[PDB]
Amino acid sequence: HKSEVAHRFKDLGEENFKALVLIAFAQYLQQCPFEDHVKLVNEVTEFAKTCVADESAENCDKSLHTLFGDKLCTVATLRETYGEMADCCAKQEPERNECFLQHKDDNPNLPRLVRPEVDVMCTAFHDNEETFLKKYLYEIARRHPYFYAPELLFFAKRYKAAFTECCQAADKAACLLPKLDELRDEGKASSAKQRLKCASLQKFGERAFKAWAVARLSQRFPKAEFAEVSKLVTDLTKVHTECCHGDLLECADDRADLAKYICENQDSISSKLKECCEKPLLEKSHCIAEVENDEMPADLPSLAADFVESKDVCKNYAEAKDVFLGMFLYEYARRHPDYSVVLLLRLAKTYETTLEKCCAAADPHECYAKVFDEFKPLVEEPQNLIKQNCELFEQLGEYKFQNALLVRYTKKVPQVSTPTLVEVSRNLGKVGSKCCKHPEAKRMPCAEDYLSVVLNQLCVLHEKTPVSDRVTKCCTESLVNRRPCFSALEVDETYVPKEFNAETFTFHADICTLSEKERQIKKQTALVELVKHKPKATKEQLKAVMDDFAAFVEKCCKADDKETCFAEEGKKLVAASQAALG
Numbered sequence: 001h002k003s004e005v006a007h008r009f010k011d012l013g014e015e016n017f018k019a020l021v022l023i024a025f026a027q028y029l030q031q032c033p034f035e036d037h038v039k040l041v042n043e044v045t046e047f048a049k050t051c052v053a054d055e056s057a058e059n060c061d062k063s064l065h066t067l068f069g070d071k072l073c074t075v076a077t078l079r080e081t082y083g084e085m086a087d088c089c090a091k092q093e094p095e096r097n098e099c100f101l102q103h104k105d106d107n108p109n110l111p112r113l114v115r116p117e118v119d120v121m122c123t124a125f126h127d128n129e130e131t132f133l134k135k136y137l138y139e140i141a142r143r144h145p146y147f148y149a150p151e152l153l154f155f156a157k158r159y160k161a162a163f164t165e166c167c168q169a170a171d172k173a174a175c176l177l178p179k180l181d182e183l184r185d186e187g188k189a190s191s192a193k194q195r196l197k198c199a200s201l202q203k204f205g206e207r208a209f210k211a212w213a214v215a216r217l218s219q220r221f222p223k224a225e226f227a228e229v230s231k232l233v234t235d236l237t238k239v240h241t242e243c244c245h246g247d248l249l250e251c252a253d254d255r256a257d258l259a260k261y262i263c264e265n266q267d268s269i270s271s272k273l274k275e276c277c278e279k280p281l282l283e284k285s286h287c288i289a290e291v292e293n294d295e296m297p298a299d300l301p302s303l304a305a306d307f308v309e310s311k312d313v314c315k316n317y318a319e320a321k322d323v324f325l326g327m328f329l330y331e332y333a334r335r336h337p338d339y340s341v342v343l344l345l346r347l348a349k350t351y352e353t354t355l356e357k358c359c360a361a362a363d364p365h366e367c368y369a370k371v372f373d374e375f376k377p378l379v380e381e382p383q384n385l386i387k388q389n390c391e392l393f394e395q396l397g398e399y400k401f402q403n404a405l406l407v408r409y410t411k412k413v414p415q416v417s418t419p420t421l422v423e424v425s426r427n428l429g430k431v432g433s434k435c436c437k438h439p440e441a442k443r444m445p446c447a448e449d450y451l452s453v454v455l456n457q458l459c460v461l462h463e464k465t466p467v468s469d470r471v472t473k474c475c476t477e478s479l480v481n482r483r484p485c486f487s488a489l490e491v492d493e494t495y496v497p498k499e500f501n502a503e504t505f506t507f508h509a510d511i512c513t514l515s516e517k518e519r520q521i522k523k524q525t526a527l528v529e530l531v532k533h534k535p536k537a538t539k540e541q542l543k544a545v546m547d548d549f550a551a552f553v554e555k556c557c558k559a560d561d562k563e564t565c566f567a568e569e570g571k572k573l574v575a576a577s578q579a580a581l582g
């Protein structure tokens, strides 16, 4: 177009335009005050409007990269605040924008964002909606400078509905806090997959990413032909490679191009895309990414004919090995939306290894005849684990399910910090709660998605503060092998028990007067610390001690004197528990 900024403004709408321009400045100038970015936004928006009225007005034909970089270089404090990033302004485009991109700081060391009281939030929301929500947007954007801006905007708009509904409710906090917790966990998760996907592309290559994408898109678009899936995989690989480089506008163009191709070809891809494809550009590609799987075609034949029985297996494979493995993966995936993507990749890897071994033999068919039997234990292993864990979650409830996991994992890797053991065990309990309510045909994809987020969080914490080599291995192997690796962890035999520290097992009266969540953590903390002190304790000996602590709390809490109970009866529980484990 003659004026990129006019076209963006017309397509997006003023309100969406303003929001994104705020996110984009906040992601680059992460240390500047909210009020400075509001002024930059208003100037850029006023200029955009001059181009909307006349596409030939002065400077309106400059690239949006040029205008954005030009405006970055107007910031008076650029050098004093950002140092060498101010030297980016001495370059011309496209080198200037590349330079700015390299100075985004993924760890800007900003104070934690403190959640105000519910009534303070609802009063701020009422008295000034715009500043209230837009300031928070700026705060999140400047802490998450690679977070895809449109998706950050999609989260922000859902906060409005939450405040509109809950601030007119009778119990405002009971209404509002669960939704804000859900929105925040959803945001942190989306951030987790984004950074996880880019890291995986760098370490394990384009080929491995394409394999993941064949499987995922074949589950999603089972009626599409392989040639069509393969094209989508190529284009999707390009989009993610560009989006991982990190420039908003080049990412957004690639994503919109793919969405428009998908929407122009729905007849050959999926019957479930009509709604997404009538949405505005801003939302189309995100909507398509969340489309539910199309219904699979009826009475599809078994894979045995083309991949085991045919005389031409080895010949078709040898001609173009990755194209044939892709076809095997496409046929298997489209038939099994109930499988994790990584389970499908394990079947593909198994098939490839067998073909590599067997096509060398004189009778390849006899060699690979039973290959589909090799898939049986790979499929049943996750299926059985889901059943086991969903049964225990129902028997125990979320909390006591968390406690069963906490003891299990503390014994397996007792060297992990207690805060991490508590947080990870809790989050794993929440994966059980979420995914065990899905029917069996959607449980493995759910667990794959939410475990990826939890195990990724574990691994980042552990890379930052390494303590266990077994965890470093599970965290550094292929993503296909990460969860089985962790599942294979065994109780640590060579752990020397941590020395007794009395204050660790000293509880005061405040425990009764604490948020139910914080009371769970503190109880979960002493449970880990108990296991860390006596890692050979039995389930019998542990539930016995945990029952004594449960009386110790309920008595000393509803007592005329609470403190003296905690200190005197506290020595009694510790000494009894000490003898009951030593």
Ligand SMILES: COc1cccc2c1cc([N+](=O)[O-])c1c(C(=O)O)cc3c(c12)OCO3
Pocket: 113, 114, 115, 116, 121, 132, 133, 136, 137, 140, 152, 155, 156, 159, 180, 181, 183, 184, 187
């Ligand atoms: C893209 O993320 C956001 C966009 C827009 C608003 C918010 C938000 C993220 C968060 N947060 O901190 O994760 C919150 C919280 C919270 O959870 O404390 C409390 C709030 C919020 C937001 O708007 C007013 O009150």
Ligand SMILES: CCCCCCCCCCCCCC(=O)O
Pocket: 204, 207, 208, 209, 210, 211, 212, 214, 230, 233, 322, 323, 325, 326, 329, 345, 348, 349, 352, 478, 479, 480
């Ligand atoms: C058509 C392009 C993709 C073809 C992929 C065929 C299968 C590749 C090998 C098996 C999967 C390996 C996955 C991984 O190493 O992470």
Ligand SMILES: CCCCCCCCCCCCCC(=O)O
Pocket: 008, 020, 021, 024, 044, 064, 067, 068, 150, 248, 249, 252, 253, 255, 256, 259, 281, 282, 283, 284, 285, 286
């Ligand atoms: C000075 C303006 C700089 C920022 C401009 C932001 C434009 C973002 C458009 C995003 C469209 C999303 C499309 C898609 O994700 O498929």
Ligand SMILES: CCCCCCCCCCCCCC(=O)O
Pocket: 216, 217, 220, 236, 239, 240, 243, 255, 258, 259, 285, 286, 288, 289, 290
């Ligand atoms: C950056 C990704 C843009 C996505 C555009 C639509 C592509 C097809 C959607 C099917 C699901 C893809 C999920 C994924 O991208 O990991």
Ligand SMILES: CCCCCCCCCCCCCC(=O)O
Pocket: 340, 342, 343, 382, 385, 386, 387, 389, 390, 428, 429, 431, 432, 435, 444, 447, 448, 451, 483, 484
């Ligand atoms: C506590 C987590 C949810 C309950 C069941 C989890 C069982 C292990 C993971 C299932 C499969 C995930 C993906 C995979 O490795 O194929």
Ligand SMILES: CCCCCCCCCCCCCC(=O)O
Pocket: 389, 409, 410, 413, 416, 420, 421, 424, 425, 451, 458, 483, 486, 487
């Ligand atoms: C983060 C605490 C120490 C390490 C814990 C490893 C986590 C293993 C989870 C593997 C997948 C679920 C297994 C299960 O649900 O039984």
Ligand SMILES: CCCCCCCCCCCCCC(=O)O
Pocket: 403, 505, 523, 524, 526, 527, 530, 533, 545, 546, 549, 550, 573, 574, 577, 578
């Ligand atoms: C070394 C002696 C320690 C004795 C005290 C151990 C306290 C463990 C409490 C764990 C409670 C978890 C279950 C519950 O929520 O009641």
